[PDB]
Ligand binder design. Structure first.
Ligand SMILES: [Mg+2]
Ligand SMILES: [Mg+2]
Ligand SMILES: [Mg+2]
Ligand SMILES: [Mg+2]
Ligand SMILES: [Mg+2]
Ligand SMILES: [Mg+2]
Ligand SMILES: [Mg+2]
Ligand SMILES: [Mg+2]
Ligand SMILES: [Mg+2]
Ligand SMILES: [Mg+2]
Ligand SMILES: [Mg+2]
Ligand SMILES: [Zn+2]
Lengths: 143, 153, 96, 129, 70
RNA sequence: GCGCUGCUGCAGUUGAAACGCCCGUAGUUGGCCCCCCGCCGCCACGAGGAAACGGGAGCGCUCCAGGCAGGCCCGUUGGACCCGCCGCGUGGGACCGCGCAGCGGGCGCGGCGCGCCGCGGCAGCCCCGAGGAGAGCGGGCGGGGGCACCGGUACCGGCCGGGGACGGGUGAAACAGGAUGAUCCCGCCGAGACCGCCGGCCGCGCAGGCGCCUGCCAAGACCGCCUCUGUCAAUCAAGGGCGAAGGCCGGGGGCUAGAAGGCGAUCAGACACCACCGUAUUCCCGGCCGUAAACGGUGCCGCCCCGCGGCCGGCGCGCGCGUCCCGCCGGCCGCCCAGGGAAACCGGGAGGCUCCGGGCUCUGGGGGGAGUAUGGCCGCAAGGCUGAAACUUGAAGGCAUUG
């Protein structure tokens, strides 16, 4: 038929699948290697960096808001990223030139929501979880 | 007409179910053998021989009288051509094409036809080189085809 | 999608056909796609045919005709009402 | 070119039975076709048939009586192990109670039930139900 | 009313010789008297024992004769 | 999850996707037939080779995850057995593929060879001839190809004569022409293109494409056949050849039209559409380029299949003999019952398929970035073949309904 089907045709089928399975975006992104060399976290759950600028970013057209984020530089790479601290009033707990831990959003490496070109989240600052600081479980009187 | 074309007719011949001779047959198996002998001496190809036998002598099939085919009889009598007939005719046609072309070389359809004919010749020659009907050294060359035609004819 | 099974032309058992020029705009058209009509008309309009025949000196003279073939393109046929835009079911009717 | 004579025969049979015909003619005859038809006849799907000799490409005539719902071939002959028949039965047959699967073995052409009885395996030819 | 195993001999004559239940010739032999057997579809020239010329007119299908022969 | 990587089991007319066409090697696939012998695959059984893990027989660590224990009056108390194999042995021998080179007896030693002997013992030694292919004879068929030759008006230019004021062109006008006689009528001369009405649900060709007379050369499919051979076959990376128009190199030719350019109008503007002039080009020879909505947007080979009808080529039957009607093969088309499909629609399949396996080749996997960058090959060049990533985005698309 369209596909070869003879009893001595295993080699051709193997080669066909080998060539054709590179056309899937997911399979390429996983098994090609470019993404790993381009991802600032090099396949890690989260990274540690230093905040250097506190900035606010406007939202997209159908929304109207200014989201609070900070600029970070990763210790182990020295490159630059933008990480966004979501919880209300949690910008005031983050201070310039502070040690932070930055993780990802739900999606692997795409932008999430109406925030344009942002792919990282702040979770720990100065060794204390932001979620815990927001609930008043602990206090940052060491800084 | 399928190998080198797109047509597909079905003009053929359908021989009878029974293999026996005609009730009005008046020829012993030998008498035809002499007729084949003298016809072959006149350089007659087997196909024409069968045509002549069927039309002039009223013999529908030679095998039904003698039990054997014409070329086998000729080989037993040592008269069969070294080069088989179909191949020889293909080579004739190729030579004719080449001559007409060297007269005038602006005709492209003729070159197309020549390509087809030479491909067919190569295939048939390979098959005959296998089956040990031709010498292993036999090879067809465009520039010496007329010579082989003359000697092998 | 596809509107006509003939693709708007009468082309069977061939690859290419010779071209013609529209008689109105002089556009180049394939011969199988151009709209053709044949007409037969009198050289003299019928209003004055009787007058001409009366003035004629010869006996039994017959008014000559004009035999011409008109060929038009698709745009010009529609603009000049040579053909009409029809309904989906009436596109299949082929009788005049 | 022609390759699988059995596939053509079975397709013709199903086509004829679809429109409630009574007889069919399949052009090329073969031993495998004959055994397939004999098994079908013993199971009660196609009644009688006749083989017509012409020296070349013997023809066959078969008489139909409804009953048959589907027939087919598996082109590349896979080698079923004796204990691997249940998976093919489940995949191919509507139920585990009335379909038949044909195999060719060193003991001859038989059904999957018979091969299970003798605890042997072989190669697959086709199926009908 | 109809059985494929025993076709009517006449409806078989109207079918193609290869699609018949048994493939067979459409040709035959016949006598000629100017007293010899001649093929129906003769293509090559034929002569009599006496006739000094030909008695065959090859055509696309069945051969024609000179009418003098019966 | 995902039948969104599809062996089981996707898709390829229109949504993404059938190379422009042909030849062709590797590769893959190959009709039917011999009753038993040998070989390969195949199936079954077996030997041999660590456990742990996994499966699994028995046992109340109080249950359990576990462990191999344990009971008295214990199989010899128990820890049984299976599971890491492309190799080895026995059997079967349906299916799948290969087997060209006489035999038997006597000399002849126990056997096997090399040899010598009766042919005096043998039926001594060829399936058939695929609605597979190729070759052959006969018959007509056709805008199929190449070479030379040749006719006809018409556009353009020139000339003899006539006559006397506008003519051309447009929606309407204005640039170019005219007393140096224009436009118009007739006659002759020159050159180069072109092939009309017939001309078509006609036809030919592998496709691109094919239309004056005459003559020459080679070729091709189809039909008809109790002519020949005997599997010679199908499809295809690599490789080879052909390939509209435009374009390029080198030579010829110069009439029409006409990119570029120029000029008059229109418009707010108009460097565009309309009018006029006009170079390359359009024509021939030799050679490059190798692309098109190169479309039936449907790959090639093969089987079955409702009914009605038209046209072309060839053959046969019948009669009341008409270029009548009844058939067969091949080709080009129309409508259509089933069936199929998201539907439009197809139905000479886009059917016989989730009831999902005839054979071979190619392509596709959300939209952009992008047929781009960087390399390589080809090409005089223009450019062709091959061909990413980062980054970005939530829809883009198809067929159909109402407004
Ligand atoms: Mg081929
Ligand atoms: Mg055929
Ligand atoms: Mg539209
Ligand atoms: Mg075209
Ligand atoms: Mg898909
Ligand atoms: Mg589109
Ligand atoms: Mg598409
Ligand atoms: Mg050109
Ligand atoms: Mg295409
Ligand atoms: Mg499928
Ligand atoms: Mg994509
Ligand atoms: Zn017009």
């Amino acid at each position: 038929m369209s596909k070869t089907s003879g009893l001595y045709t295993a080699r051709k089928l193997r080669t066909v699948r080998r060539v054709n399975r590179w056309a899937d975006k997911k399979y390429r992104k996983a098994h090609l290697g470019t993404w790993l060399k381009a991802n600032p976290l090099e396949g890690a759950c989260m990274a540690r960096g230093i905040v250097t600028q506190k900035i606010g970013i406007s939202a997209k057209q159908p929304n109207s808001a200014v989201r609070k984020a900070v600029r970070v530089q990763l210790t182990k790479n020295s490159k630059k990223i933008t990480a966004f601290v979501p919880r209300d009033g949690s910008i005031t707990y983050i201070d310039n030139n502070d040690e932070v831990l930055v993780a990802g959003f739900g999606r692997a490496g795409r932008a999430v929501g109406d925030i344009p070109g942002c792919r990282f989240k702040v979770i720990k600052v100065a060794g204390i979880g932001l979620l815990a600081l927001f609930l008043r479980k602990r206090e940052k009187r060491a800084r | 007409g399928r190998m080198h074309s797109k047509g597909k007719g079905i003009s053929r011949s359908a021989i009878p179910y029974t293999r026996a001779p005609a009730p009005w047959n008046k020829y012993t198996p030998e008498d035809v053998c002499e007729q084949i002998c003298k016809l072959a001496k006149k350089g007659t190809p087997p196909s024409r021989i069968g045509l002549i036998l069927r039309d002039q002598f009223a013999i529908g099939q030679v095998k039904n009288v003698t039990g054997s085919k014409i070329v086998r009889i000729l080989k037993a009598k040592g008269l069969a051509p070294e080069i088989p007939e179909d191949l020889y005719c293909m080579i004739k046609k190729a030579v004719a094409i080449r001559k007409h072309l060297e007269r005038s070389r602006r005709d492209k359809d003729s070159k197309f036809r020549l390509i087809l004919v030479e491909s067919r010749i190569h295939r048939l020659a390979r098959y005959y080189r296998q089956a040990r009907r031709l010498p292993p050294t036999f090879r067809y060359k465009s520039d010496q085809a007329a010579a082989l035609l003359a000697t092998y004819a | 999608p596809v509107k006509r099974r003939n693709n708007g032309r009468s082309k069977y058992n061939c690859g290419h056909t010779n071209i013609v020029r529209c008689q109105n705009c002089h556009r180049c058209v394939p011969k199988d796609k151009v709209i053709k009509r044949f007409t037969i008309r009198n050289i003299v309009d019928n209003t004055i045919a009787d007058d001409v025949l009366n003035a004629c000196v010869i006996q039994g003279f017959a008014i000559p005709k004009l035999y011409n073939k008109v060929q038009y393109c698709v745009s010009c046929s529609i603009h000049n009402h040579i053909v009409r835009v029809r309904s989906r079911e009436d596109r299949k009717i082929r009788t005049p | 070119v022609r390759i699988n004579v059995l596939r053509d025969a079975l397709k013709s049979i199903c086509n004829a039975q679809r429109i409630g015909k009574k007889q069919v003619i399949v052009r090329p005859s073969s031993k495998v076709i004959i055994e397939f038809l004999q098994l079908m006849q013993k199971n009660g799907y196609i009644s009688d048939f006749a083989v017509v000799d012409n020296h070349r490409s013997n023809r066959i005539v078969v008489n139909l009586i409804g009953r048959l719902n589907k027939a087919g071939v598996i082109s590349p002959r896979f080698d079923i192990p004796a204990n691997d028949i249940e998976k093919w039965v489940v995949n191919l047959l509507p139920s585990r109670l009335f379909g038949h699967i044909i195999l060719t073995t060193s003991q001859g052409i038989m059904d999957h039930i018979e091969a299970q009885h003798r605890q042997i395996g072989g190669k697959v030819i086709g199926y009908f139900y | 009313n109809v059985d494929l195993l025993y076709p009517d001999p006449v409806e078989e004559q109207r079918k193609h010789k290869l699609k018949r239940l048994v493939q067979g010739p459409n040709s035959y032999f016949l006598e000629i008297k100017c007293i010899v057997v001649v093929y129906s579809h003769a293509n090559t020239p034929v002569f009599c024992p006496g006739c000094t010329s030909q008695i065959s007119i090859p055509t696309g299908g069945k051969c024609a004769f000179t009418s003098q022969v019966e």
